[PDB]
């Protein structure tokens, strides 16, 4: 936010506001960022994939 | 006329008995889609 | 069978509430406990209810009044 | 093709209930009925004693 408020340019106005929106969406939603790298993998029921 | 399992039998019963009443419930395909989405690392559920 | 449905439309106007009133009337007529106020002509409850509505006797008010009167009379 | 054919079949016991549904009866009669025709073989006589 400080970098976007202080420094202003043609290429600085973009590629930074989207990052701020991404940080806000990751903070307000509660979802941890480390949750993007999954540890356990879920697998479908067997009835949704018959023999 | 769809994949709703708990509705087809009830509609057949109402037509044989002459009631002409519909109970929608929920299609099974939506549950299949929910399970297939939950098969990945993306949580999804329906609130109240 | 009823060819065109226009009188009931003029009695309702909204063209949407007419279907709901006719359905809530035909449901009762089919399940029982009611009597067709219009003399039937070997027709099903749907057309009977629709013609009774187009005649100017069944709407979204008289039905509610009758239901409230029947519930209070219990 | 995901489901290939996957034609759900009749199954006898399944056939028995389809007529259970359109037989007329009470909740207690429909409860015992599910119990009875629950306990019935491929051959068709019942497995458990009536008592």
From Swiss-Prot, chain A:
Superkingdom of this protein's organism: Bacteria
Entry comment on modification after translation: Acetylated on several lysine residues in the presence of glucose.
Biotechnology: Co-administration of salinamide and rifampicin or salinamide and myxopyronin suppresses the emergence of resistance to both antibiotics.
Disulfide bonds: none
Function of the protein: DNA-dependent RNA polymerase (RNAP) catalyzes the transcription of DNA into RNA using the four ribonucleoside triphosphates as substrates.
Family, per entry: Belongs to the RNA polymerase beta' chain family.
Subunit structure: The RNAP catalytic core consists of 2 alpha, 1 beta, 1 beta' and 1 omega subunit. When a sigma factor is associated with the core the holoenzyme is formed, which can initiate transcription. The rRNA transcription and antitermination complex (rrnTAC) consists of RNAP, NusA, NusB, NusE (rpsJ), NusG, SubB, ribosomal protein S4, DNA and precursor rRNA; S4 is more flexible than other subunits.
Name listed for the protein in its UniProt record: DNA-directed RNA polymerase subunit beta'
Protein source organism: Escherichia coli (strain K12)
Gene, per the UniProt record: rpoC
UniProtKB/Swiss-Prot annotation, chain B:
Protein name: DNA-directed RNA polymerase subunit beta
Family: Belongs to the RNA polymerase beta chain family.
Gene: rpoB
Post-translational modification as stated in the protein's UniProt record: Acetylated on several lysine residues in the presence of glucose.
Quaternary structure annotation from Swiss-Prot or TrEMBL: The RNAP catalytic core consists of 2 alpha, 1 beta, 1 beta' and 1 omega subunit. When a sigma factor is associated with the core the holoenzyme is formed, which can initiate transcription. The rRNA transcription and antitermination complex (rrnTAC) consists of RNAP, NusA, NusB, NusE (rpsJ), NusG, SubB, ribosomal protein S4, DNA and precursor rRNA; S4 is more flexible than other subunits. In pull-down experiments interacts with CedA. (Microbial infection) Interacts (via flap domain) with Escherichia phage lambda antitermination protein Q; this interaction renders bacterial RNAP resistant to transcription pausing and allows it to read through termination signals.
Protein's job: DNA-dependent RNA polymerase (RNAP) catalyzes the transcription of DNA into RNA using the four ribonucleoside triphosphates as substrates. Resistance to the antibiotics salinamide A, salinamide B, rifampicin, streptolydigin, CBR703, myxopyronin, and lipiarmycin can result from mutations in this protein.
Boundaries of the shown chain within the full protein: 1294 to 1341 of 1342
Domain of life of the native organism: Bacteria
Industrial or biotech use: Co-administration of salinamide and rifampicin or salinamide and myxopyronin suppresses the emergence of resistance to both antibiotics.
UniProtKB/Swiss-Prot annotation, chain C:
Function, in words: Promotes RNA polymerase (RNAP) assembly. Latches the N- and C-terminal regions of the beta' subunit thereby facilitating its interaction with the beta and alpha subunits.
Catalytic activity: RNA(n) + a ribonucleoside 5'-triphosphate = RNA(n+1) + diphosphate
Keyword Transcription recorded: yes
Name of this chain's protein: DNA-directed RNA polymerase subunit omega
Family under the similarity heading: Belongs to the RNA polymerase subunit omega family.
Keyword Ribosomal protein applies: no
Keywords in alphabetical order: DNA-directed RNA polymerase, Nucleotidyltransferase, Transcription, Transferase
E.C. code: 2.7.7.6
Single Gene Ontology MF annotation: DNA binding
Subunit structure: The RNAP catalytic core consists of 2 alpha, 1 beta, 1 beta' and 1 omega subunit. When a sigma factor is associated with the core the holoenzyme is formed, which can initiate transcription. The rRNA transcription and antitermination complex (rrnTAC) consists of RNAP, NusA, NusB, NusE (rpsJ), NusG, SubB, ribosomal protein S4, DNA and precursor rRNA; S4 is more flexible than other subunits.
Gene: rpoZ
